[PDB]
Amino acid sequence: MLAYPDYFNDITSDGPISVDDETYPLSSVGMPYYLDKLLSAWPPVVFKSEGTIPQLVISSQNEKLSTQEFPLLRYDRTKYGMRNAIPDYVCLRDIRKQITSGLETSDIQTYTSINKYEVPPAYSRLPLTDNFDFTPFNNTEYSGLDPDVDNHYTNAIIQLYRFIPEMFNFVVGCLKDENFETTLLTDLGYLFDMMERSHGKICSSSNFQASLKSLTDLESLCIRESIESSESIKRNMPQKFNRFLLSQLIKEEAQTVNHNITLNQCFGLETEIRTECSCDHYDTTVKLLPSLSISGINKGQNILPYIEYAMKNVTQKNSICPTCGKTETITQECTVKNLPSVLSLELSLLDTEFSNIRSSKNWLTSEFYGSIIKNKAVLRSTASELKGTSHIFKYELNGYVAKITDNNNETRLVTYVKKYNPKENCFKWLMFNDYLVVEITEEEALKMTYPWKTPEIIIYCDAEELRKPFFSVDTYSINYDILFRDYFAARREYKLLTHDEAPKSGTLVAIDAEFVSLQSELCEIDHQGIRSIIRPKRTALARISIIRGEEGELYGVPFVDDYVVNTNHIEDYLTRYSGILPGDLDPEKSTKRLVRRNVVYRKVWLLMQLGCVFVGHGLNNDFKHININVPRNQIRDTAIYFLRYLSLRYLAYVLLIQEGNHDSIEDAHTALILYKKYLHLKE
Amino acid sequence: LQYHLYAPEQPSSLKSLLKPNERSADQLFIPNNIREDLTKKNLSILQVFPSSGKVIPSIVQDYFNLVPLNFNNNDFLNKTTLFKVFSNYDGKAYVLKRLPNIDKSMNPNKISKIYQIWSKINCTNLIKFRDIFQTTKFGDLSICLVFDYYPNSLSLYDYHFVNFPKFPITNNYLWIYLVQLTNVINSIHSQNLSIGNTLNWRKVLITGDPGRIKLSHCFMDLLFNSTIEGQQQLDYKYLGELLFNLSINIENSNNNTAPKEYRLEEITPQSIDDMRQIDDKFKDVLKYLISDNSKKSIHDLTSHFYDKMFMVLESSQTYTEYMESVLSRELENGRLFRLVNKLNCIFGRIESRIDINWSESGTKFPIILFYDYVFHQVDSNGKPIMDLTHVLRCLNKLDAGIQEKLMLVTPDELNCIIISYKELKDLIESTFRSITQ
Amino acid sequence: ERSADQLFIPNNIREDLTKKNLSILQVFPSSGKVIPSIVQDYFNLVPLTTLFKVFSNYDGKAYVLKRLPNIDKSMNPNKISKIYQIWSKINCTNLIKFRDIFQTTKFGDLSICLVFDYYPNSLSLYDYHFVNFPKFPITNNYLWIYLVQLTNVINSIHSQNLSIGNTLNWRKVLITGDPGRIKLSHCNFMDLLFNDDTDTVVSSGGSTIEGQQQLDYKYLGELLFNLSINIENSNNNTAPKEYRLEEITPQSIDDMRQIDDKFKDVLKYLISDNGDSKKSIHDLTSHFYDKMFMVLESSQTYTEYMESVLSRELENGRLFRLVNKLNCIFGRIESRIDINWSESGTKFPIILFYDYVFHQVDSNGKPIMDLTHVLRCLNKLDAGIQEKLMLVTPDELNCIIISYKELKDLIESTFRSITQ
């Protein structure tokens, strides 16, 4: 009937014209008279897609198994997202330009905006950061983090974990012993010590990030698999990072002397997976997992059912078993036996679900009660609503990390957190975006209504355990051995400390350090004189030297003189400004070479903890690149107020000579003498 | 008879709000005014009305399918002088003007002479003059002229004050008018021929905006049963009449007030000096045109304004580039359309619909996946949306042979296929050919 | 071939333009950092090697980038600002527009880069007339046109008190579009950029701008001279001879063989220095006159031609929109397993109709695609005509009757439902 030629349409045409004919114009058949709007009329839609900057145990398929030679089948989170989605559009010019002070100082701390869609100033990108002192951004007593590291988003996550009492107290606790073999746990401990110690100004994650980057050179396979603007891609990474960090830390806490494995208890989830099929015979496994990843279908009122399903779920995936090679759809059922003291939630969802979540009111529950019955974990909002053993655990929201996409459609990460105040028996809510810290109201904290905000990571903790106080490392007795002995994994001379001198509060020591540049600062200049800094400078520690300050000048013997031997494939060694070998690399290096592994950092840190004052040509630059800050009490240095800074070699001749290549100990020594001059000079 | 429902322009506020990268649906395509004009042209040329053997000629000379244009007549008394015509040779139509009831047969030699002289001259902005001939089909012993058509052309008079919604007549345009008229004058005088004194508002038609001015009638007396130089200079005054008269009614034009017309006799230099809103250079030019001798030369007149001549050239060239751009884009749209037709032909086949994914075979799967990729678009946040410029990019890229690579994703989201556009074009064309035979 | 002034009419327009946008679209290079991935607002670089074709981020409008490969030290940003401010304002048809100048380290050497509007498949006069096969031999008319447009550039540049420089040679001025449209490129920005002192405050001695301003006249003379003289070398296939102000003598321009003596007078005016030159655009143009009418005439002619060819093609865009919308609505994954889109459902006629238009059966035995069928169906649907169509399920027992208007309303309703 309808087949060509039909009587309806084709009756006029004697033979078919092919679509590929250019001689035959499309105008050949005119439209008849129309009294109404055409379908071809296009609705008033804006088009944002063009000029988008590209790139920001089973195989094959289940039911897709009819294939040509072509397909390679790995997918989802790693690359893109939901099928054929259009990428959001970001314009670089608008991205790199915006901030000086923002032109605003006081109004920047306002977290609420009258417009629902508008992104508040606090969430907006903060300016990048000679030396500049940013006072107005943080009025709280809790430190913020510097945005400049290899990948800054991690900060958001770390700050969160900082407020988990168990986590913090444990990791800071592990500083008491050596534990040099564990990079991440220790470095994170020191970082924790920074954020804790300074009720005040900012701390940097640089050493942590460096160590992590060095480490990446089953979980390692996962994060490496996820691995390939420089900073741009949060695509699925932060979730994965959460898993990697947690799991790795558990792996490392094994290596500590006591084998404490407290994390294994605290974040630990016994996961029971049962596979039902043939040719696998039967297989049942149980494994401890740090975090649970949430997905789902409704089969809601609020977040809890998602959690419940995450804890007990049966899913069907098509697998090939190593037992017998039969490849078929297999059914796995996994349930978790226990409820941890602290649990971490990784949100991987269809964006539609994110929409539905934004639609719901108070979708995130401030607190909930939960217990296991049968083999099935159950979680409900109120004690009575569940009936059972009445052995129930109270879980309160400790904090969460949220992704923010502003109007320019660039992506940043921010942290929401809760802290206990023992007096008044109260809770306070805080937001951390990089070096910006704001005390905020609960109602704003829980509100999911905002369209830019998407939840990424959510951390829940036990009510009784959360209210336990935070403890600084000072309460524990600390191992000072590395100060008194030598660990080196050639320099002329130096003398290790003995038990007699007793460095303590008031003790005087001298220090200087020398650095090597891992990266050069690169600028781009458009019209109208705007300095765009792309690829920021990456600097690493090279040499550290500390000499005795007891009895005034006294002994000329160095407390420690150390080379750090770090290999990131340096661009330039700055040999002129500071003597560097090069080739300090561990295998071929003739010098006392120690993997920094906090150890030099440990010397300086135990020193500053004991409260011994530091001397130098200037403390700030050096300490800033050592990734440690010390109170002004220890701070005193030679350089004096002059029309910026003052140069030491210049001052030496004035104080009576000088040479082109200067050992660090020399600068430190001369510095110490200069301080001695400064005291007696008085008026 | 007319429809503005082809497509509504998007609201002005949106266009104002648009970011530089951001495009709107009309901007991808040909703007409405040009397409409407061209469409009206096509319709007006193409329209053919039925005819009677005895009321109107079946065939005349080399010409047929005659239809009268009843509306253009100054004759007022007798049936219309001018008719629309389709030529036998070449088509493209043309215009014909009838000259009825001639006293006595004029010799063919004279007609041949007139033809040779007026055919010899070729100038744009001067309506091309085609074959002239005498025929009996009217049985009035009638001699007729043939011109190029140049459809929907309005006289400057009709252009600004009446025919369309009234148009503002800014002096800038006046400059262009002056330049083009200067061109036709120079071109006709180059053949030493005399102008016709048809230079007044009427009979001077505009086409091809911005302002392409052309003279039509351009001398009819030579057909009929002072020296050359005298007339040749005399016309300067006529042009002056035109430009002055235009110049004075500008204010009347803006508020669409009724015009005043003035003859060259009424013109006073002081009155010219009196007028405002005009560039003193152009005023000086008008002064040159109206005043009596030092014979008036093309040299001096053109010598008055060099810069504005360059201005006119600039405008013309810019517009040319504009038109090229629009033409390129729409031709591209056509090709792309055909492509979409082939892609559509392969996709969604009824034979193919019994799997949850719609590919019948495994060979056809990648193209179908691609179809899903281009046409079935999902916004971020997970809501469906259809972009066009995306579609244009993918289709355009596919038409070419370029090696850019695509990650195509299955409807499971579990799986993917990696493919290069060259392989896609080859695959689509080969498959299409296979299906079609 | 040789023609009257139709001059801007190209031999084959469709081929040229299609090839042009095709040339615009192509990007080969990716992997290596020899050519970096992204520079400022610019990306998708392809070499033309110091010179690249680039797609901008901001505009999304393809442009070209000039690399300017090594720089002593950091450029005084104010100078760059000066260059941008000065040349961004100027607008000329025959001078390729200057959009953005910037300094970048992305090459891993210190490079300053310029960006110009794109004019694809454009060749230099050197290449166009003499070497590249087949070569169109310079006819006096074309020469006149060249002269007029370059003169335009002279007027436009000098009117803003800037000098064009030593770029007036033919190889640095390219043609855009095959037959007649000319454009020049670089304009010697090097003078303004690389100088420590230009304060643009003349002492009593006076400014140095005028001298260069005359120099431009001289250079124009050189270009036009070389082209005009090498004409015979062009007509027969042969290599050209090059000349310079130093080498150029009037006795020879008078000893020229095929040239209009008027052009000889023009060349003479341009090449010669006089005790008082005072060369103005006015005098030279006074030499010119009618040739302006020639270029304008050709321009209008080309406009008319393009309008003519465009007329046939204009309808297709609409069709594009229509098939695009229908395509949007038809095959969505969620729509695949819905009960509405099933054999008994509201949406079913859409599938049946689409099958009807696009999926044809010859003698019930194979597929065929008729174009006029597709256009007829689509046009009639767009118009929304009250006319009835009989569609089959096709489980062949029962059928559905539907009118094009109802199809139109239904389709738009569905589309609106999917969107928004």
> Can you give the CATH number for the domain in which C418 is found?
1.10.287.3700
Instruction: Assign A461 to helix, strand or coil.
Output: strand
Q: Would you list the DSSP string of A600-616?
A: HHHHHHHHHHHT-EEE-
- Confirm whether residue A426 is marked as ligand binding: no
CB contacts of B25 in chain C (<8 Å) are: 321
Question: What's the gap between Cα B405 and its chain centre?
Answer: 43
Q: Which residues contact C42 (CB under 8 A, 6 or more apart)?
A: C54, C55, C56, C57, C63, C65, C115
CA angle A197, A199, A205 (to 5 degrees): 60
- Is the distance from CB of A403 to CB of A347 less than 8 angstroms? no
- Is the distance from CB of B341 to CB of C319 less than 8 angstroms? no
Element (H or E) spanning B39, and its range?
helix B32-46
User: Under an 8 A CB cutoff, do B356 and C336 touch?
Assistant: yes
**Structure tokens given for A384:** 């009575």
Q: Which residues contact A425 (CB under 8 A, 6 or more apart)?
A: none
Domain boundary among C266, C298, C314: C314
Q: After which residues is chain B broken (C to N over 2.5 A)?
A: 218, 225, 293
* Shared domain check, C322 and C310: no
CA nearest neighbour of A647 among A635, A662, A632, A633: A662
**Structure tokens given for A639:** 């350089």
Q: Minimal Cα–Cα distance from C202 to chain B, Å?
A: 28
CA angle A514, A519, A521 (to 5 degrees): 105
User: Under an 8 A CB cutoff, do A40 and C321 touch?
Assistant: yes
User: Under an 8 A CB cutoff, do C372 and A28 touch?
Assistant: yes
User: Under an 8 A CB cutoff, do C282 and B306 touch?
Assistant: yes
User: Under an 8 A CB cutoff, do B415 and A351 touch?
Assistant: no
Q: Name the neighbours of B, counting chains with at least 3 Cβ pairs within 8 A.
A: A, C
Domain boundary among B249, B279, B305: B305
CA angle A174, A175, A178 (to 5 degrees): 95
A:220-249 residues touching chain C, CB 8 A cutoff:
none
Q: Minimal Cα–Cα distance from B70 to chain C, Å?
A: 26
CB contacts of A24 in chain C (<8 Å) are: 371-372
Instruction: For chain C, state the CA radius of gyration.
Output: 30
Domain boundary among C314, C344, C364: C314
For residue C57, the enclosing domain spans 1-314
User: Under an 8 A CB cutoff, do C382 and A39 touch?
Assistant: yes
Q: Which of A66, A82, A86 sits opposite B413 (nearest CB)?
A: A82
* Shared domain check, B202 and B65: yes
Instruction: Assign B27 to helix, strand or coil.
Output: helix
Resolution of the structure in the document, Å: 3.8
Q: Parallel, antiparallel, or unpaired: how do β-strands A508-517 and A613-615 relate?
A: parallel
CA nearest neighbour of A463 among A412, A420, A417: A420
- Confirm whether residue A612 is marked as ligand binding: no
- Asked, for residue B366, whether it belongs to a domain, the answer is yes
User: Per residue, what are the HEC states of C152-181?
Assistant: HHHHHHHHCCCCCCCCCCHHHEEECCCCCC
Q: Name the neighbours of A, counting chains with at least 3 Cβ pairs within 8 A.
A: B, C
CA angle A407, A413, A416 (to 5 degrees): 110
Q: Which residues contact A582 (CB under 8 A, 6 or more apart)?
A: A570, A573, A575
* Shared domain check, C396 and C320: yes
User: Under an 8 A CB cutoff, do A4 and C84 touch?
Assistant: no
* Chain B, nearest residue to C295 by Cα: B313
Measure Cα distances from A257 to A169, A177, A178, A261, A458 in Å: 17, 8, 8, 11, 31
Element (H or E) spanning B183, and its range?
helix B171-189
- Omega before residue C394 within 30° of 0, cis: yes
A60 touches B at CB < 8 Å: yes
**Structure tokens given for B273:** 């000096």
* Shared domain check, B391 and B254: no
- Confirm whether residue B151 is marked as ligand binding: yes
CB contacts of A1 in chain C (<8 Å) are: 390, 392
Q: Where are the alpha helices (DSSP H) in C162-315?
A: 190-193, 209-229, 231-235, 250-254, 261-271, 281-288, 290-313
- Asked, for residue B54, whether it belongs to a domain, the answer is yes
- Confirm whether residue B203 is marked as ligand binding: yes
A89 touches B at CB < 8 Å: yes
CA-CA distance, C67 to B272, in Å (whole number)? 56
* Shared domain check, B293 and B352: no
Q: Which of C26, C317, C331 sits opposite B402 (nearest CB)?
A: C26
- CATH number of the domain that C112 lies in? 1.10.510.10
- Omega before residue A165 within 30° of 0, cis: no
Instruction: Assign B87 to helix, strand or coil.
Output: strand
**Torsion over CA: A365, A367, A372, A373 (sign):** negative
* Shared domain check, B371 and B298: no
Q: Would you list the DSSP string of A604-668?
A: HHHHHHHT-EEE-S-SHHHHHHHT----HHHH--S---------HHHHHHH-----SS--HHHHH
Measure Cα distances from B157 to A165, B259, C166 in Å: 89, 9, 49
- Is the distance from CB of B394 to CB of C324 less than 8 angstroms? no
Mutate to test the interface with A, among B4, B35, B42, B381 (most CBs of A within 10 A): B381
Question: What are the backbone dihedrals phi and psi of residue B335, each rounded to the nearest 5 degrees, phi first?
Answer: -55, -50
**Structure tokens given for C231:** 């004409």
Measure Cα distances from A250 to A263, A602, B74 in Å: 6, 23, 101
* Shared domain check, B191 and B251: yes
**Structure tokens given for B116:** 């040779």
Measure Cα distances from B198 to A84, A431, B80 in Å: 65, 83, 19
- Is the distance from CB of B10 to CB of B26 less than 8 angstroms? yes
User: Under an 8 A CB cutoff, do A46 and B18 touch?
Assistant: yes
CA nearest neighbour of C150 among C243, C234, C224: C224
* Shared domain check, C386 and C260: no
CA-CA distance, A451 to A428, in Å (whole number)? 25
- Is the distance from CB of B343 to CB of B366 less than 8 angstroms? no
Our count of domains for chain B comes to 2
CA-CA distance, A261 to A256, in Å (whole number)? 9
Measure Cα distances from A229 to A56, A87, A100, B100 in Å: 7, 15, 22, 81
CA-CA distance, A318 to A63, in Å (whole number)? 9
Measure Cα distances from A88 to A193, A405, A668, B18, B382 in Å: 39, 10, 54, 16, 12
CB contacts of C365 in chain B (<8 Å) are: none
Give the sheet arrangement for strand A269-276, strand by strand. Answer: A283-289, A269-276, A327-336, A312-320
CB contacts of C77 in chain A (<8 Å) are: 525, 528-531
* Shared domain check, C274 and C174: yes
Under 8 Å CB pairs connecting chains A and B tally to 150
CA-CA distance, B52 to A41, in Å (whole number)? 42
Q: Which of C148, C327, C374 sits opposite B375 (nearest CB)?
A: C327
User: Under an 8 A CB cutoff, do B415 and A73 touch?
Assistant: yes
**Structure tokens given for A274:** 């049962």
Domains of chain A: 105-474 (3.90.70.10), 475-683 (no CATH)
CA nearest neighbour of A584 among A604, A563, A607: A563
- Asked, for residue B331, whether it belongs to a domain, the answer is no
* Shared domain check, C286 and C163: yes
Measure Cα distances from B314 to B169, C140, C299 in Å: 19, 22, 10
CA-CA distance, B277 to A171, in Å (whole number)? 84
CB contacts of A50 in chain B (<8 Å) are: 21, 23, 389-390, 393
* Chain C, nearest residue to A91 by Cα: C58
- Confirm whether residue A10 is marked as ligand binding: no
Q: Would you list the DSSP string of C16-70?
A: HHHHHHHHHH-----S-TTS-SEETTEEEEEE---EEEEEESSS---EEEE----
- Asked, for residue B321, whether it belongs to a domain, the answer is no
* Shared domain check, C333 and C283: no
User: Under an 8 A CB cutoff, do B416 and A73 touch?
Assistant: yes
* Shared domain check, C264 and C390: no
CB contacts of C15 in chain B (<8 Å) are: none
Q: Minimal Cα–Cα distance from B202 to chain C, Å?
A: 22
User: Under an 8 A CB cutoff, do A83 and B334 touch?
Assistant: no
Instruction: Assign A236 to helix, strand or coil.
Output: coil
